Structures are given as structure tokens and as C-alpha cells.
Amino acid sequence: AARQMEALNRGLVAVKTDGGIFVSWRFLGTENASVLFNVYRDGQKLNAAPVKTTNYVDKNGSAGSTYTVRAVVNGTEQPASEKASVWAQPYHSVPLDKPAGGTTPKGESYTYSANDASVGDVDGDGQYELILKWDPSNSKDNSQDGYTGDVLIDAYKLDGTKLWRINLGKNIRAGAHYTQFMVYDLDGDGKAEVAMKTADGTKDGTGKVIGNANADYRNEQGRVLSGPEYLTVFQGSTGKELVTANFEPARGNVSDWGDSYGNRVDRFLAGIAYLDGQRPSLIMTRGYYAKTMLVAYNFRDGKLSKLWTLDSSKSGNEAFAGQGNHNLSIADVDGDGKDEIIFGSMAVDHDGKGMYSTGLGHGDALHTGDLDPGRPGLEVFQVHEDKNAKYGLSFRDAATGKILWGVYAGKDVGRGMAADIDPRYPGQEVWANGSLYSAKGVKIGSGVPSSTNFGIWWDGDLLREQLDSNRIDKWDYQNGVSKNMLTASGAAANNGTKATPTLQADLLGDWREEVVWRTEDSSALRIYTTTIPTEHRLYTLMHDPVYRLGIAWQNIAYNQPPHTSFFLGDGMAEQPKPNMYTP
Ligand SMILES: [Ca+2]
Ligand SMILES: [Ca+2]
Ligand SMILES: [Ca+2]
Ligand SMILES: [Ca+2]
Ligand SMILES: [Ca+2]
Ligand SMILES: [Ca+2]
Numbered sequence: 001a002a003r004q005m006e007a008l009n010r011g012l013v014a015v016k017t018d019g020g021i022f023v024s025w026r027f028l029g030t031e032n033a034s035v036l037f038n039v040y041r042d043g044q045k046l047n048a049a050p051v052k053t054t055n056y057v058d059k060n061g062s063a064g065s066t067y068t069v070r071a072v073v074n075g076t077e078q079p080a081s082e083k084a085s086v087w088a089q090p091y092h093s094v095p096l097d098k099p100a101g102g103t104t105p106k107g108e109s110y111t112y113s114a115n116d117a118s119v120g121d122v123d124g125d126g127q128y129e130l131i132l133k134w135d136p137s138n139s140k141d142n143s144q145d146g147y148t149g150d151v152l153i154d155a156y157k158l159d160g161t162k163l164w165r166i167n168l169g170k171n172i173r174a175g176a177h178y179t180q181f182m183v184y185d186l187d188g189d190g191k192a193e194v195a196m197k198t199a200d201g202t203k204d205g206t207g208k209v210i211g212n213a214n215a216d217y218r219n220e221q222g223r224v225l226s227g228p229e230y231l232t233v234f235q236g237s238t239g240k241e242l243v244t245a246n247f248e249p250a251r252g253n254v255s256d257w258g259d260s261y262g263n264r265v266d267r268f269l270a271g272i273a274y275l276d277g278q279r280p281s282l283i284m285t286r287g288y289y290a291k292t293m294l295v296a297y298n299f300r301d302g303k304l305s306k307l308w309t310l311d312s313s314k315s316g317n318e319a320f321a322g323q324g325n326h327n328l329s330i331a332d333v334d335g336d337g338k339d340e341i342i343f344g345s346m347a348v349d350h351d352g353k354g355m356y357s358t359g360l361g362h363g364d365a366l367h368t369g370d371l372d373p374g375r376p377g378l379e380v381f382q383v384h385e386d387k388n389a390k391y392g393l394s395f396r397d398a399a400t401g402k403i404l405w406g407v408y409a410g411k412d413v414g415r416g417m418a419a420d421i422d423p424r425y426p427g428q429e430v431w432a433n434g435s436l437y438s439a440k441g442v443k444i445g446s447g448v449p450s451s452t453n454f455g456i457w458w459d460g461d462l463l464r465e466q467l468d469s470n471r472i473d474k475w476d477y478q479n480g481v482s483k484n485m486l487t488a489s490g491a492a493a494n495n496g497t498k499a500t501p502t503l504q505a506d507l508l509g510d511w512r513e514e515v516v517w518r519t520e521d522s523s524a525l526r527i528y529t530t531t532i533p534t535e536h537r538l539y540t541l542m543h544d545p546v547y548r549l550g551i552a553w554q555n556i557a558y559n560q561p562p563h564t565s566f567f568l569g570d571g572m573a574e575q576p577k578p579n580m581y582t583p
């Protein structure tokens with residue numbers, strides 16, 4: 001079946017460069033291969049004949065010029081795109097309303113920094129808003145005791161308009177593994193909503209407090225290990241509470257999850273999955289080191305409804321404990337049109353049934369995509385934390401879980417990457433624990449790229465570049481060394497040693513991915529878009545099933561980079577139009 005996807009505008013962007021004005025725009029999932037384009041500067045056509053490629057350099061444009069693009073569909077020109085003004089800097093700043101610092105019940109002062117983001121179109125005009133999580137400077141890993149400041153979630157238009165702020169309140173602890181926020185048009189009306197775990201004292205964007213306003217379930221460890229827990233869907237445009245239910249997976253006893261001090265119980269993940277093959281569902285998970293639960297919901301016709309539960313503590317589900325990562329993937333792995341869940345070393349079917357477990361246990365990085373385009377199906381590359389695991393890195397059939405190849409490490413392998421960086425080996429290369437491999441498991445040369453964090457499509461070629469901290473690098477495959485391509489001076493990455501951008505996504509312009517980094521003082525987000533010309537046109541990545549879902553889960557726990565459902569890389573085949581409709 002055709003999948004619900006977003007009605008997007010042209011995503012037209014124009015950026016001042018020394019060579020003139022660089023202009024790029026979207027090839028929309030609704031458009032055929034036969035569609036061409038005309039480029040207009042202030043109502044004047046620039047190109048003598050319609051162009052195919054979705055980027056263009058206007059040598060004679062100026063900082064005051066405005067641009068439109070018109071599609072040419074089966075010979076006739078279509079109405080103009082939305083108008084685009086010229087970016088006077090290589091990035092676009094979104095000014096932020098930095099939350100005031102505070103002081104914990106124990107007298108610890110904290111301040112706020114801009115942290116993980118997501119995107120959704122909350123008003124339905126085809127341009128994304130940014131949904132930003134603020135992090136207090138005393139946020140905590142689950143292993144660490146201590147009180148934390150409130151978690152704040154804001155919505156911003158790209159012009160800097162602050163639409164709202166939600167304060168999750170004292171009963172939601174701050175830290176990577178706590179709030180996992182989903183931004184998506186769940187009900188299919190054309191407008192995104194925001195869904196996340198909430199509690200008594202959560203304040204919506206209109207200033208209305210949920211539940212028992214004054215209840216305080218913080219224990220002396222600064223953890224919230226008792227009291228009600230809620231799941232709320234908020235209106236994207238206003239941050240208003242739409243509906244709130246009791247949260248599942250429910251806590252039960254803290255000790256059910258594998259410790260009594262409050263670590264394992266509060267290990268959350270979340271996602272958007274097309275469980276019915278047509279429309280989105282919401283996935284909320286709890287646990288992964290031992291007891292593990294996953295619960296699916298719909299938000300449709302104004303109602304939240306629970307669809308299924310997978311609980312490893314149920315007789316027959318024992319194998320589905322102890323396998324999850326600090327991240328997950330979502331993809332149709334078995335070809336039935338419906339999305340499955342890649343939950344670290346295990347997988348869960350669209351109906352909530354456990355599919356397989358590799359038994360290799362918990363890890364910190366995960367990549368699900370078409371890694372080996374010579375092998376039908378998707379593949380999963382994963383690293384493993386247990387020093388005694390049979391493999392420190394595993395490369396597997398996404399659908400069956402069969403190990404295609406793996407390498408024993410005998411130690412915690414905390415990072416792993418997948419990206420087509422070497423055109424001499426068909427498909428995506430993978431690297432971890434000091435070695436680079438082909439998709440077939442053949443070690444390539446010696447050493448690895450200088451980062452093992454994100455892959456990003458940045459330059460004009462079909463290979464994928466690397467992102468880490470405030471840097472984009474490109475692998476010189478002939479010489480076996482990384483070389484810097486961009487250092488975003490004045491921009492900072494997030495999450496300490498994880499060094500993740502606020503967001504990486506194809507948010508605007510052509511198929512290359514934008515990066516959103518905070519400034520060092522979090523007074524702004526900067527949106528960088530490439531001005532490197534390309535000869536290639538590809539469907540906007542937000543119209544790919546798997547990529548779009550990757551953007552939805554990018555924020556969760558230990559942020560991972562997004563992948564396409566198809567092999568995008570050197571030697572790739574031309575892609576057909578995505579099977580989609582818009583609301
Ligand atoms: Ca919008
Ligand atoms: Ca909606
Ligand atoms: Ca499927
Ligand atoms: Ca299935
Ligand atoms: Ca870990
Ligand atoms: Ca494959």
C-alpha cells in the first residue's frame with residue numbers, strides 16, 4: 001500500500017557564495033522522473049532550457065534577490081514555488097529563547113543548553129518546524145544519582161518564532177535515557193503532533209499542568225521511581241495537551257528490571273512505525289539490559305489506543321530480554337509493507353511478536369539499511385558492549401537475524417559506523433574497533449576513518465561523508481585517511497563525548513543533508529546547508545520510508561545517524577518514485 005507521508009513545499013533555498021548564489025530544492029516524492037525545472041530570479045527565468053538537477057548556481061544574483069522554481073510536468077509549467085530569499089551566511093540562524101537557570105532542592109545551580117531536536121510540520125505549510133529539547137547542566141546518566149533541573153521542549157519556526165514551551169516538570173528526570181520525544185503527524189490531518197512520557201506536574205504549552213500539579217515523586221537520589229506515569233500527545237502548533245493516558249510499559253516494581261537503585265527501569269526508547277503498512281503508529285519501549293517491554297499505540301480520530309505489548313517477562317518471551325541498544329531502527333525488513341522494529345540484537349514484528357534474537361546482547365550503535373546491495377533484503381550492523389560476546393561487531397540479515405559475518409573483539413566496542421566511503425567495494429563499508437570492512441566482512445587496509453559517529457551526505461558525490469563534533473570529514477579511500485571538509489566555527493555539538501549535532505536531516509534544498517548545531521552559548525541554532533554542486537537528483541530523503549523514520553528517532557537515547565530504505569551510494573540504481581500519498 002501507499003504510505004502516508006508529508007505534503008512538503010519546494011524546500012527552495014538560496015545561499016550566497018563567492019561564485020554567486022547557490023540555489024537548491026526538493027525533488028518531491030509525488031513527482032515523476034520526467035519532471036524538469038525552471039529557475040526564476042525575481043520573476044525572471046535564468047535557464048534557457050528546463051533543468052533536471054535540483055541545484056543551480058546563479059552567477060549574477062545578489063543578497064537582495066529572491067528566487068522561485070517552477071516544475072515542468074509533461075510539457076507544461078506549473079505555478080511558482082514559495083519564494084526564497086538569499087542567506088547572507090553559509091548557515092541560517094534560528095534565535096532561541098534560552099531558559100533561565102535554576103537551583104535544585106540541594107542548592108546546586110544549573111543552566112540550560114540546546115540539545116537534541118526533531119522536526120515536524122506543525123501548521124501544514126510544507127516547511128518543517130524544529131522541536132528542541134533543552135538540557136540542564138546537571139542532567140544525569142541512569143547510573144548516577146542526583147537531582148536534575150526540569151526538561152523543557154520548545155517549538156520554533158525557521159524564522160525564529162517560538163511557538164511554545166512544554167515544561168516536563170519535577171517528576172521527569174533529565175538525561176539521555178529519560179525523555180524520548182516523537183514528532184509526527186500521527187492522525188494524518190497534515191499537521192505534526194508531539195508525543196512523550198509525562199508526569200504529574202508536566203506543564204503544557206498553554207500553561208496547563210497535567211495530573212496532580214504539586215505531587216513530588218522525586219526520591220532522595222533525585223530519581224522518580226514511584227507515582228503515576230503518563231503518555232501525552234500534544235498539539236504541534238500550540239503544545240496543548242490533546243490526550244493523556246497512563247504510560248505503558250508501566251513501571252511495576254523497580255527491581256523487576258534488574259536493579260533496585262533505579263537504573264534499568266528507566267531505560268526508554270521510542271519510535272514511529274507503520275505497523276499497518278499505511279499509517280504511522282507510536283512505539284514506546286522500556287528496559288533493555290534485562291526485562292524489556294515494547295508497546296504500540298495509535299493516535300487517530302482524536303483518540304489514543306493501545307495496539308499491542310511485547311513483554312520479555314511473559315512465558316515464551318525470555319529470549320527478548322537483554323538484547324536492546326541505547327537506540328533502535330524501524331524498517332520493513334520482511335517485505336510485507338509493514339514496519340518491523342530492530343531493537344539492538346533482537347527484532348519485533350509489526351504485530352508485536354518477537355522475531356529473533358542474535359543473543360549478542362546490548363550495544364551502543366546500530367545501523368539498519370541496505371548495507372549490502374548485492375544481497376536481497378536489509379542488513380543490520382551492530383556493535384556489542386559485553387567483552388565476552390561472541391562478536392564485538394555483527395553484520396546480519398535484518399529479517400531473519402542470521403549472522404552474515406561477525407568479528408570477536410574480547411572488549412566493549414562502543415562505536416560502529418556504516419557508510420559507503422570506498423567505491424572499490426560495492427555497498428556500504430562498516431567500521432568498529434579499529435578496523436574498516438566491506439559489506440562482506442573483508443578488512444580494508446589498516447585503520448579507520450577519524451570518527452565513528454554519524455554519516456552524512458554533504459558533498460556532490462554519492463559516497464557518504466562523516467560527521468562528528470562540529471566537523472564534516474571526507475574519507476580519502478585511496479590513501480586511507482580522513483580529511484576535514486567543514487569545521488563549523490562557533491557551533492558546538494551536544495551530549496559530551498557522544499558529540500552529536502542538534503539534528504542532521506535533509507530539511508530543505510536538494511537531497512544532501514542539513515546539519516543543525518547550537519551556538520556555544522545556545523543563543524541560536526544554526527542550520528548549515530551544502531553549497532557544493534552535485535550532478536545528482538534524488539527524491540527528498542524525508543519521502544523515503546526508512547530515512548523519515550530515522551529522523552523521528554534521531555533524538556532517542558544515544559542518537560544514531562539516519563539511513564535510506566534503498567542503497568544510496570556509488571553504483572546505485574536509479575530509484576523509482578516512492579509509494580506514498582499525502583493528507
Ligand atoms: Ca510549518
Ligand atoms: Ca496531526
Ligand atoms: Ca514488514
Ligand atoms: Ca511483518
Ligand atoms: Ca551501553
Ligand atoms: Ca541488501
Ligand SMILES: [Ca+2]
Nearest residue numbers: 422425426427
Ligand atoms: Ca563501498
Ligand SMILES: [Ca+2]
Nearest residue numbers: 459461462463
Ligand atoms: Ca558524498
Ligand SMILES: [Ca+2]
Nearest residue numbers: 508509510512
Ligand atoms: Ca537538503
Ligand SMILES: [Ca+2]
Nearest residue numbers: 555556557559
Ligand atoms: Ca539523545
